[PDB]
């Protein structure tokens, strides 16, 4: 069947599910940003900017 | 039938040396990179940038001549002939290191030219472009070592100089300063290059020793016809031999030849990444846990601590002369030395 | 299996080839020789002659230390020898 | 069948052109031995040690007792001239024979004479040619004995009073000694046969070797191979070549270590100090210098806590300290006078070091077999000035390299001989591929 | 820079006199120093006793002063320890010991002057590198 | 039906999953001995006094090492070239302090690998093959002999053989560069040419064959399913590869004969590694890389440095630092 390194080629002629994948990627990236900010806020010391 | 298509015809004619569209980038740059190096190695000093003789004219042999890098004061200047530093004086340009950037930049564009040639010839002839793809490994090594690396540092001064022994000094600089041998991206590169040579030798040997008898002569080279359909060696006997010798063997001639592409290309790419880190002095210099133990415990000694003493010797003993723009003056008494030596 | 250029083995066994190239080849070898024996190669390229790496009582490299005054520095150094 | 680049393989079954190839090639050998000696003598300055002059043949002649007197001083150069001229002249005669038999002579010998003709598969004829050559070699070994006992002796670096040419009157015959060496471990402090350290054992071993060689020669003339040997070996020209390539490889390796470690049959007077010798010499040199300044060398504790100058081997013997602790098995004429039963003797060290031993120590420490391919003497970091590479390194390296390629040649021709004997040296018969007739492994 | 008469002008004696060598004598001497002395004295050090070197300042504090042509010619004939207290011809090359150091046999008087002149000139050319050892290589 | 003939028949059988053979009869026990000792010592051996100065060096994981820093440490310089089997030691404790496992491992290993090379000859004969794969392997075998046996012989001590460790390997090659200048030695340079060149030709030959595969599959499947193990027809078009590569350079720089091509692929790296093995083996007797230290001087006699002198500064830094407590005298003559 498809090798492991080609599984996402099933989207090349499926604009619908291509958009679905691009949405999920975009979801994960924005998810990351939000999680990264919250982690930095929980650990940041704001009391000496010098 | 316009001029473009007429010119296409003429570039792509079947001649002793194929030209192509890619030849317009390739051939001038290839030839100027080559010309610059031979010119500089024959006639051009490194006195003003390095304090070094480096041409045949000055007394150097093939192993010590180099087109050396520009002085550290040039920063990352392009050092164009017509630029603010040389101001068009060809002679000064040579004494300031202008042939280094000239050679590096034309070489870079020549390497692009060559990879486009691989693409151009591949398309015309109807084969897949895997030889082009493979050539990305050399390009990564070249750009990462000759361009990215010195761009992360203070100046072009610390790139490699184009010369046999100058490259040897680059090797030792990286040991003493970056502890480059401790870097796993270099280690993967080593495995890829030595794995490549292994695969080269073992595949060549296997084929030549599983040959079919296809003519009667003691020299078996004559019994290959380049248009025969039949394989010229027995995959079945080779596979049995290695299966019983080594435990595993290849059974797929396509995977085998793909693997031979994959191993060295990957190793070079991996070493290139390590070098990108060293542009920033982001080394794998140390193991923190060993240093904490060793600082507290003077009886703890590894091959790891022994090699760092070596690095410390390298830096202190080579830096004044290798980095003359710094005016390091190290009295005899500050130099690190073991007993007696 | 040829592209129409004349074979090399055919050219370099030919009397005409060697009639032209027994003049050209030594002429070039002699020219490059004179490039060096005349001293011209020193002056074109900027390479120090054996006696002009240092001034007489000087043991300091004349190292370019400036980017935009570099040209002038080299010239200052060359004065220190004449 | 063979290509131009395998062209000498076309001589396998042409005994006449093959005789010529061998004889003409023996001429090249004798020629080189001749020219090279004359080249060395043309360049030889007698007031310089031989080993400062790139000499490898003249030291071989000196060691045989010709040209030299006490201490290795060269006293008469005419025997060196003679040895070169005679070799040189004799090569023309071999060269003449060699090109006669390769070009004009009978291309095959067997038609001309059943004595000189051979077929490789004739086990009796082959053991008979081997028999003859065994005898020749037996004689060669006895020529060494004759020289040592009846024609001047040999140079003896160990002779009291600096070394000297000495005639050998009581060669060692005791097989326990002679064959004892063959049974010694090749490892440190043991040395297999490389440890031979006196000329009596050298000469005795050669009597034995000459007798054994003559007896074997005769044995192999009178016998044919037994059936266990017949079934064990391949019997073909290429197979015999492979056996001899194996043997020369082995011998090349042995000679490497002999010129690297042995200072009896390679006197350091001529060849320069061995690696171990020069290292021991340095420790001696600084022991001498520091003791002259007042240092008590036996009681000086070095940085590690071991003796700075003197420590104990792992079996207790008092030895030189520093890294040369590895070299304590070294024995040499300038150093044995300081050895007592427990190793180096502190009272001999404190009282009885002579100037000649100070000079020899200094000479050997400054002539160690370290230097560059372009003959800059010393450690890799030393500056140009001294043009020296020890003959011991030139001979050790060269013969290592040759020995290794002959082992490769042994493998090459042995495997080919085997495959040719069974008939698949040219590849696999498509119609009868053996693997296709075997069961699969899984 | 070049090999000028100033460079080649070295002291003849301790009185004050000077001799000016030629390029010929200098290259002569360098060559004989390599033949007869560099095996121990490469670069102006002394391998077999590194506490004593051939730096002009060291030679000038030798007893008999050796920082002049005469001191050095004399040393090559009848060497002494640094304090002049003992003759050491038996373990150091010299004409007196030319039986046991054969390389000294063919050295003429003018060969000695060349060697001595090279020794005094070289530190003027290489500075600290002469007698400084590996630190200055 | 004779008992010994039965044993000789199983030993040399071509139906065993792994061929044994007569060489295998030495190889198997010697490699198991070396392997089992190496694994145990790499994990658990105590510190070893490699330079004979009572300065033990910790090599094993349990004594504070990781995978990169760990080693089985060479035997003590006090031993030199002396044979140090277990039974020559008063106790296993002594043997461990003094480095005895290194000797056990390297002598069993060298034996077993030598037999590995014989075994390759031997199975080729039983299968009716040509014989020379083992000549190819003799390049790496020679290289192992050089760093574990020949170099220790010439220098006088197994304490200067290559450590069985990753960082120990680096220590070995750094100190080799200071004492020999392998980089300026031509036989190492051919080694580099052998190994760079082999990686290059590896990639070329792999890319050229892959480029010219004959279409036998669809886009949805690995091209590799277009070759069936044991098919008679070639799976690529060597004329298309030759036509591509001949044009990339020029015609007569590209092979049309597959046998010459594969022989060339065998010969290049094998020969370059022969040389590099011989370089280690000849620097074992101190015939070192080219020395151009102070080779260029000006008209007064000033030294004019070259890249070779900068190399020398580095080499000096390695020299003065290595084995920092082990030298009492000025010259490191071995
Ligand atoms: C792979 C594809 C294959 C195809 C390859 C094709 C090859 C094309 C070759 C292109 C040549 C590139 C020229 C880059 C020169 C450079 O950078 O020149 C450097 C200059 C900046 O100059 C440097 O700037 C430095 C910082 O200066 C500043 O800081 C100083 C100290 O405070 C002072 O304030 C000073 O005034 C102020 O300018 C120092 O002054 C240096 O000496 C000076 O050289 O940037 C500039 O030209 C431009 C910098 C911004 C653009 C970034 C370029 C991207 C390439 C860089 C990627 C490497 C990233 C490094 C990380 C690893
Ligand atoms: C915008 C970026 C982008 C996009 C959209 C694609 C899309 C595609 N690539 Mg391409 N590729 C890219 C960048 C991109 N690539 C880069 C940067 C490289 C060089 C590294 C490649 C090298 C490459 C090769 C060599 C191949 C493809 C192939 C493919 C196709 C199949 C991929 C698949 O099934 O993966 C399946 C992959 C997995 C199931 C697991 C991979 C996990 C990797 C090893 C590491 C983990 C990644 C990490 C989780 C997340 C990324 C973080 C960071 C990079 C952002 C698909 C159309 C294949 C193709 O052409 O098929 C026809 C193919 O063979 N790509
Ligand atoms: C006593 C030694 C000996 C003898 C008699 C033979 C005899 C033979 N060999 Mg074997 N061989 C030997 C040693 C020997 N070999 C060694 C030591 C090796 C390993 C290096 C080999 C490896 C070998 C191979 C691989 C092959 C043979 C083959 C053959 C046959 C043909 C050889 C031929 O025509 O050469 C013709 C000679 C040349 C083409 C020139 C060789 C050029 C050398 C390599 C260059 C060396 C240059 C030198 C280092 C310095 C140059 C300085 C410069 C100024 C010029 C012949 C029966 C062939 C065979 O199997 O036939 C059955 C074959 O294919 N030989
Ligand atoms: C020591 C090296 C050596 C020796 C002794 C030989 C000897 C021989 N070879 Mg080999 N061979 C060698 C190296 C050597 N070869 C190498 C390196 C190669 C690779 C190119 C070959 C390739 C090769 C091929 C391809 C063939 C041989 C053949 C032969 C034989 C016949 C030659 C012939 O017909 O002459 C013809 C040549 C001439 C008439 C030219 C004249 C050469 C003369 C002898 C030079 C002598 C000059 C000398 C200064 C004279 C001194 C005279 C004075 C002493 C009186 C001959 C026995 C042939 C053979 O086996 O025949 C069946 C054959 O086919 N050889
Ligand atoms: C096989 C043993 C052997 C050995 C150990 C030596 C060793 C020596 N020779 Mg003799 N020589 C030999 C064979 C041998 N030679 C042969 C066959 C010839 C004829 C060509 C000569 C011709 C010769 C001359 C004319 C001279 C020497 C000189 C010397 C000395 C300097 C070597 C040097 O700088 O090489 C430089 C190193 C090389 C050239 C490297 C070669 C590497 C090759 C290509 C690799 C080979 C691999 C395969 C085989 C040295 C003591 C010199 C000397 O001092 O004489 C008193 C001298 O002038 N030799
Ligand atoms: C091992 C080398 C060798 C071998 C096996 C042969 C074998 C042969 N030769 Mg050749 N030949 C050789 C060397 C060799 N020769 C040399 C070196 C030369 C030049 C001198 C010649 C010149 C030559 C010619 C010109 C002719 C032969 C002929 C013959 C055949 C008959 C020989 C015979 O009965 O003569 C009779 C034998 C004797 C009178 C032997 C007398 C004792 C000898 C000369 C001295 C032996 C002493 C000692 C072992 C070696 C010399 C000492 C030295 C080492 C200091 C025979 C096939 C003939 C032939 O076949 O032509 C068709 C022929 O006409 N040979
Ligand atoms: C050039 C020398 C030479 C050569 C090539 C031969 C060749 C041969 N001999 Mg002769 N032989 C020689 C010299 C030589 N011999 C001498 C001088 C003598 C007198 C002692 C003999 C006495 C002799 C007898 C009595 C017999 C042979 C036999 C044979 C055949 C079988 C050889 C065999 O299987 O041994 C291969 C070796 C073995 C099977 C045993 C191995 C024993 C050794 C010592 C092991 C040690 C190897 C070790 C790693 C290396 C270090 C050495 C160690 C002692 C320190 C073969 C034709 C046999 C035959 O058929 O005769 C007609 C036979 O019965 N030979
Ligand atoms: C559903 C929903 C919701 C929610 C959401 C959420 C909850 C989200 C989350 C999300 C998130 C939470 C996400 C995150 C993500 C993350 C990521 C995506 C990551 C990534 C990672 C990476 C990829 C990594 C990599 C790496 C590593 C690991 C190592 C080093 C190197 C690197 C960096 C490469 C809401 C309410 C709004 C609304 C309704 C709906
Ligand atoms: C830079 C520049 C330029 C360019 C230039 C050029 C382009 C040049 C060229 C040049 C060249 C083009 C040169 C050449 C040279 C060459 C040489 C110098 C060669 C040599 C060789 C040899 C030495 C070899 C030898 C050998 C050997 C060793 C071995 C084998 C054989 C043989 C013979 C190969 C211009 C003008 C734009 C201007 C700007 C700058
Ligand atoms: C066969 C052949 C070959 C080879 C050949 C041979 C190897 C040769 C031989 C030859 C020979 C091996 C020769 C030799 C010769 C010699 C001579 C001819 C001698 C003479 C000498 C003289 C004349 C001397 C004189 C003198 C004197 C008496 C004194 C001192 C001085 C003098 C030196 C002057 C070849 C491969 C090429 C080719 C193929 C065929
Ligand atoms: C002179 C001299 C001497 C003496 C010595 C001698 C007496 C020797 C001996 C020698 C010997 C007496 C040797 C032996 C050898 C042997 C061998 C080397 C063997 C070999 C073998 C083999 C090779 C085999 C093989 C095989 C097998 C195992 C199986 C089956 C098959 C075959 C057969 C293949 C001395 C040191 C005292 C001193 C100095 C001088
Ligand atoms: O290089 Mn430097 O040299 Ca051969 O030894 Mn003397 O020191 Mn020590 O022990 Mn391993 O290493
Ligand atoms: Cl170390
Ligand atoms: Cl020491
Ligand atoms: Fe292939």
Curated annotation (Swiss-Prot), chain A:
The chain crosses the membrane at residues 16-36. It is found in: Cellular thylakoid membrane. Residues 1-15 are cytoplasmic. Belongs to the PsbB/PsbC family. PsbB subfamily. PSII is composed of 1 copy each of membrane proteins PsbA, PsbB, PsbC, PsbD, PsbE, PsbF, PsbH, PsbI, PsbJ, PsbK, PsbL, PsbM, PsbT, PsbX, PsbY, PsbZ, Psb30/Ycf12, peripheral proteins PsbO, CyanoQ (PsbQ), PsbU, PsbV and a large number of cofactors. It forms dimeric complexes. Part of a photosystem II (PSII) assembly intermediate complex PSII-I; crystallized from a strain deleted of psbJ, it forms monomeric PSII before addition of the oxygen evolving complex. PSII-I includes 3 assembly factors not found in mature PSII (Psb27, Psb28 and Psb34). One of the components of the core complex of photosystem II (PSII). It binds chlorophyll and helps catalyze the primary light-induced photochemical processes of PSII. PSII is a light-driven water:plastoquinone oxidoreductase, using light energy to abstract electrons from H(2)O, generating O(2) and a proton gradient subsequently used for ATP formation. This is Photosystem II CP47 reaction center protein. It comes from Thermosynechococcus vestitus (strain NIES-2133 / IAM M-273 / BP-1). The chain holds residues 2 to 51 of 510 of the full protein.
Curated annotation (Swiss-Prot), chain C:
The chain crosses the membrane at residues 17-37. Its cofactor is heme b. Pfam families: Cytochrom_B559 (PF00283), Cytochrom_B559a (PF00284). It is a single-pass membrane protein. SUPFAM superfamilies: Cytochrome b559 subunits. It is found in: Cellular thylakoid membrane. Heme binds at residue 21. Heterodimer of an alpha subunit and a beta subunit. PSII is composed of 1 copy each of membrane proteins PsbA, PsbB, PsbC, PsbD, PsbE, PsbF, PsbH, PsbI, PsbJ, PsbK, PsbL, PsbM, PsbT, PsbX, PsbY, PsbZ, Psb30/Ycf12, peripheral proteins PsbO, CyanoQ (PsbQ), PsbU, PsbV and a large number of cofactors. It forms dimeric complexes. Part of a photosystem II (PSII) assembly intermediate complex PSII-I; crystallized from a strain deleted of psbJ, it forms monomeric PSII before addition of the oxygen evolving complex. PSII-I includes 3 assembly factors not found in mature PSII (Psb27, Psb28 and Psb34). This is Cytochrome b559 subunit alpha. It comes from Thermosynechococcus vestitus (strain NIES-2133 / IAM M-273 / BP-1).
UniProtKB/Swiss-Prot annotation, chain E:
Its cofactor is heme c. Disruption phenotype: Cells do not grow photoautotrophically under low CO(2) concentrations. One of its GO terms (biological process) is photosynthesis, light reaction. One of its GO terms (molecular function) is iron ion binding. The keyword Transcription does not apply. Its main location: membrane. It is found in: Cellular thylakoid membrane. The keyword Magnesium does not apply. Binds 1 heme c group covalently per subunit. PSII binds multiple chlorophylls, carotenoids and specific lipids. Keywords: Electron transport, Heme, Iron, Membrane, Metal-binding, Photosynthesis, Photosystem II, Signal, Thylakoid, Transport. Heme c binds at residues 41, 92. Coiled coil: none annotated. PSII is composed of 1 copy each of membrane proteins PsbA, PsbB, PsbC, PsbD, PsbE, PsbF, PsbH, PsbI, PsbJ, PsbK, PsbL, PsbM, PsbT, PsbX, PsbY, PsbZ, Psb30/Ycf12, peripheral proteins PsbO, CyanoQ (PsbQ), PsbU, PsbV and a large number of cofactors. It forms dimeric complexes. One of the extrinsic, lumenal subunits of photosystem II (PSII). PSII is a light-driven water plastoquinone oxidoreductase, using light energy to abstract electrons from H(2)O, generating a proton gradient subsequently used for ATP formation. The extrinsic proteins stabilize the structure of photosystem II oxygen-evolving complex (OEC), the ion environment of oxygen evolution and protect the OEC against heat-induced inactivation. Low-potential cytochrome c that plays a role in the OEC of PSII. This is Photosystem II extrinsic protein V. The chain holds residues 27 to 163 of 163 of the full protein.
Curated annotation (Swiss-Prot), chain F:
The record marks 180 as: Stabilizes free radical intermediate. Fe cation binds at residues 205, 262. It is a multi-pass membrane protein. One of its GO terms (cellular component) is plasma membrane-derived thylakoid membrane. The D1/D2 heterodimer binds P680, chlorophylls that are the primary electron donor of PSII, and subsequent electron acceptors. It shares a non-heme iron and each subunit binds pheophytin, quinone, additional chlorophylls, carotenoids and lipids. D1 provides most of the ligands for the Mn4-Ca-O5 cluster of the oxygen-evolving complex (OEC). There is also a Cl(-1) ion associated with D1 and D2, which is required for oxygen evolution. PSII binds additional chlorophylls, carotenoids and specific lipids. PROSITE patterns: REACTION_CENTER. A quinone binds at residues 205, 254-255. It is an enzyme of class 1 (oxidoreductase). Pheophytin a binds at residues 116, 120, 137. Chlorophyll a ChlzD1 binds at residue 108. The chain crosses the membrane at residues 22-43, 101-122, 133-153, 182-207, 263-285. It holds the Pfam family Photo_RC. Its main location: membrane. C-terminally processed by CtpA; processing is essential to allow assembly of the oxygen-evolving complex and thus photosynthetic growth. 2 of the reaction center chlorophylls (ChlD1 and ChlD2) are entirely coordinated by water. Belongs to the reaction center PufL/M/PsbA/D family. This is Photosystem II protein D1 1. It comes from Thermosynechococcus vestitus (strain NIES-2133 / IAM M-273 / BP-1).
């Amino acid at each position: 069947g498809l090798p492991w390194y080609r599984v996402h080629t099933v989207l090349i002629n499926d604009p619908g599910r291509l958009i679905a994948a691009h949405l999920m990627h975009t979801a994960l990236v924005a998810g990351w940003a939000g999680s990264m900010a919250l982690y930095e806020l929980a650990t940041f010391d704001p009391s000496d900017p010098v | 039938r316009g001029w473009f298509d007429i010119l296409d015809d003429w570039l792509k004619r079947d001649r002793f040396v194929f030209v192509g569209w890619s030849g317009i980038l390739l051939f001038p740059c290839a030839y100027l990179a080559l010309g610059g190096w031979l010119t500089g190695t024959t006639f051009v000093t490194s006195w003003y940038t390095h304090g070094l003789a480096s041409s045949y004219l000055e007394g150097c042999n093939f192993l010590t001549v180099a087109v050396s890098t520009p002085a550290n004061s040039m920063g990352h200047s392009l050092l164009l002939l017509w630029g603010p530093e040389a101001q068009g004086d060809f002679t000064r340009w040579c004494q300031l290191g202008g042939l280094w950037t000239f050679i590096a930049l034309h070489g870079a564009f020549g390497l692009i030219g060559f990879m486009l040639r691989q693409f151009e010839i591949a398309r015309l002839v109807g084969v897949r472009p895997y030889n082009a793809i493979a050539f990305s490994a050399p390009i990564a090594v070249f750009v990462s070592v000759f361009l990215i690396y010195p761009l992360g540092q203070s100046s072009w001064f610390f790139a490699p100089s184009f010369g046999v022994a100058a490259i040897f000094r680059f090797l030792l600089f990286f040991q003493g300063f970056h502890n480059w041998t401790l870097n796993p991206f270099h280690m993967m590169g080593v495995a890829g290059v030595l794995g490549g040579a292994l695969l080269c030798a073992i595949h060549g040997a296997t084929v030549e020793n599983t040959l079919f008898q296809d003519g009667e002569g003691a020299s078996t080279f004559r019994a290959f016809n380049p248009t025969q359909a039949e394989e010229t060696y027995s995959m079945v006997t080779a596979n049995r031999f290695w299966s019983q010798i080594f435990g595993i063997a290849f059974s797929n001639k396509r995977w085998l030849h793909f693997f031979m592409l994959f191993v060295p290309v990957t190793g070079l790419w991996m070493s290139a990444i390590g070098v990108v880190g060293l542009a920033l002095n982001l080394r794998s210099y140390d193991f923190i846990s060993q240093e904490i133990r060793a600082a507290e415990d003077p009886e703890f000694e590894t091959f790891y601590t022994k090699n760092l003493l070596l690095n410390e010797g390298i830096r202190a003993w080579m830096a004044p002369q290798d980095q003359p723009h710094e005016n390091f003056v190290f009295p005899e008494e500050v130099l690190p030395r073991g007993n007696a030596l | 299996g040829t592209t129409g250029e004349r074979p090399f083995s055919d050219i370099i066994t030919s009397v005409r080839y060697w009639v032209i190239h027994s003049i050209t080849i030594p002429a070039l070898f002699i020219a490059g020789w004179l490039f060096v024996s005349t001293g011209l190669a020193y002056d074109v390229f900027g390479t120090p002659r054996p006696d002009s790496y240092y001034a007489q009582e000087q043991r300091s490299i004349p190292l370019v230390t400036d980017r935009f005054e570099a040209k002038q520095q080299v010239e200052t150094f060359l004065e220190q020898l004449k | 069948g063979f290509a131009w680049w395998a062209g000498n393989a076309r001589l396998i079954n042409l005994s006449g052109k093959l005789l010529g190839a061998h004889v003409a090639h023996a001429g090249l050998i004798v020629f080189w031995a001749g020219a090279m000696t004359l080249f060395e003598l043309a360049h030889f300055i007698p007031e310089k040690p031989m080993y400062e002059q790139g000499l490898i043949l003249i030291p071989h002649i000196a060691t045989l007792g010709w040209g030299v007197g006490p201490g290795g001083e060269v006293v008469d150069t005419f025997p060196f001239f003679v040895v070169g001229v005679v070799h040189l002249i004799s090569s023309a005669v071999l060269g003449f024979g060699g090109v006669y038999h390769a070009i004009r002579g009978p291309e095959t010998l067997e038609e001309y004479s059943s004595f000189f003709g051979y077929d490789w598969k004739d086990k009796n004829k082959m053991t008979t040619i081997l028999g003859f050559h065994l005898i020749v070699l037996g004689i060669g070994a006895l020529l060494l004995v004759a020289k040592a006992m009846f024609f001047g002796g040999l140079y003896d670096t160990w002779a009291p009073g600096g070394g000297d040419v000495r005639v050998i009157t009581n060669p060692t015959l005791d097989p326990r000694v002679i064959f004892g060496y063959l049974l010694k471990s090749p490892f440190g402090g043991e040395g297999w046969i490389v440890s031979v350290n006196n000329l009596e054992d050298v000469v005795g071993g050669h009597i034995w070797i000459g007798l054994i060689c003559i007896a074997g020669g005769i044995w192999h003339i009178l016998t044919t191979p037994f059936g266990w040997a017949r079934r064990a070996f391949i019997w073909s020209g290429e197979a015999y070549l492979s056996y001899s390539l194996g043997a020369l490889s082995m011998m090349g390796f042995i000679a490497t270590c002999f010129v690297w470690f042995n200072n009896t049959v390679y006197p350091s007077e001529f060849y320069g100090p061995t690696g171990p010798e020069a290292s021991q010499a340095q420790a001696m040199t600084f022991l001498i210098r520091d003791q002259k300044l007042g240092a008590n060398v036996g009681s000086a504790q070095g940085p590690t806590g071991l003796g700075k100058y003197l420590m104990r081997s792992p079996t207790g013997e008092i030895i030189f300290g520093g890294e040369t602790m590895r070299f304590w098995d070294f024995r040499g004429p300038w150093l044995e006078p300081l050895r007592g039963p427990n190793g180096l003797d502190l009272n001999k060290i404190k009282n009885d070091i002579q100037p000649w031993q100070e000079r020899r120590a200094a000479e050997y420490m400054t002539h160690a077999p370290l230097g560059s391919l372009n003959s800059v003497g010393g450690v890799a970091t030393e500056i140009n000035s001294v043009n020296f590479v020890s003959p011991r390194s030139w001979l050790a390296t060269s013969h290592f390299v040759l020995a290794f390629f002959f082992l490769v040649g042994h493998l090459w021709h042995a495997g080919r001989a085997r495959a040719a004997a069974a008939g698949f040296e040219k590849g696999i018969d498509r119609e009868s591929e053996p693997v296709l007739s075997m069961p699969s492994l899984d | 820079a070049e090999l000028t008469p100033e460079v080649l002008t070295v002291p003849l004696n301790s009185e004050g006199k000077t001799i000016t060598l030629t390029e010929k004598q200098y290259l002569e001497g360098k060559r004989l120093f390599q033949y007869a002395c560099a095996s121990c004295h490469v670069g102006g050090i002394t391998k077999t006793n590194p506490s004593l070197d051939l730096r002009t300042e060291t030679l000038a504090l030798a007893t008999p002063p050796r920082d002049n042509i005469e001191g050095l010619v004399d040393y090559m004939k009848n060497p002494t320890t640094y304090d002049g207290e003992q003759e050491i011809a038996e373990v150091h090359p010299s004409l007196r010991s030319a039986d046991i150091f054969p390389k000294m046999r063919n050295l003429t008087e003018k060969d000695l002057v060349a060697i001595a002149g090279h020794i005094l000139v070289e530190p003027k050319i290489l500075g600290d590198k002469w007698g400084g050892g590996k630190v200055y290589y | 039906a004779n008992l010994w003939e039965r044993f000789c028949n199983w030993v040399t059988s071509t139906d065993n999953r792994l061929y044994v053979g007569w060489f295998g009869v030495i190889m198997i026990p010697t490699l198991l001995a070396a392997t089992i000792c190496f694994v145990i010592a790499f994990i658990a051996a105590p510190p070893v006094d490699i330079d004979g100065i009572r300065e033990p060096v910790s090599g094993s994981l349990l004594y504070g090492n990781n995978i990169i820093t760990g080693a089985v440490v060479p035997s003590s310089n006090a031993i030199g070239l002396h044979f140090y089997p277990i039974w020559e030691a008063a106790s296993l404790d002594e043997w461990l302090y003094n480095g005895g496992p290194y000797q056990l491992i390297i002598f069993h290993f060298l034996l077993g690998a030598s037999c590995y090379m014989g075994r390759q000859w031997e199975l080729s004969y039983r299968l009716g093959m040509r014989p020379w794969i083992c000549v190819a392997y003799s390049a790496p075998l020679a290289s192992a002999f050089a760093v574990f046996l020949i170099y220790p012989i010439g220098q006088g001590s197994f304490s200067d053989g290559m450590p069985l460790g990753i960082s120990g390997t680096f220590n070995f090659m750094i100190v080799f560069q200071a004492e020999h200048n392998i980089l300026m030695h031509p036989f190492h340079q051919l080694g580099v040419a052998g190994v760079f060149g082999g990686a290059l030709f590896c990639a070329m030959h792999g890319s050229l064959v892959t480029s010219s595969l004959i279409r036998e599959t669809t886009e949805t499947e690995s091209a590799n399913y277009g070759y069936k193990f044991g098919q008679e027809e070639e799976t690529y078009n060597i004329v298309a590869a030759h036509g591509y590569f001949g044009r990339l350079i020029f015609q007569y720089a590209s092979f049309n004969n597959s046998r010459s091509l594969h022989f060339f692929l065998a010969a290049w790296p094998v020969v370059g590694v022969w040389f590099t093995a011989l370089g280690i083996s000849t620097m074992a007797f101190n015939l070192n890389g080219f020395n151009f230290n102070h080779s260029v001087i000006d008209a007064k006699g000033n030294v004019i440095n070259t890249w070779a002198d900068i190399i020398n500064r580095a080499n000096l830094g390695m020299e003065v630092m290595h084995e920092r407590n082990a030298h009492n005298f000025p010259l490191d003559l071995a």
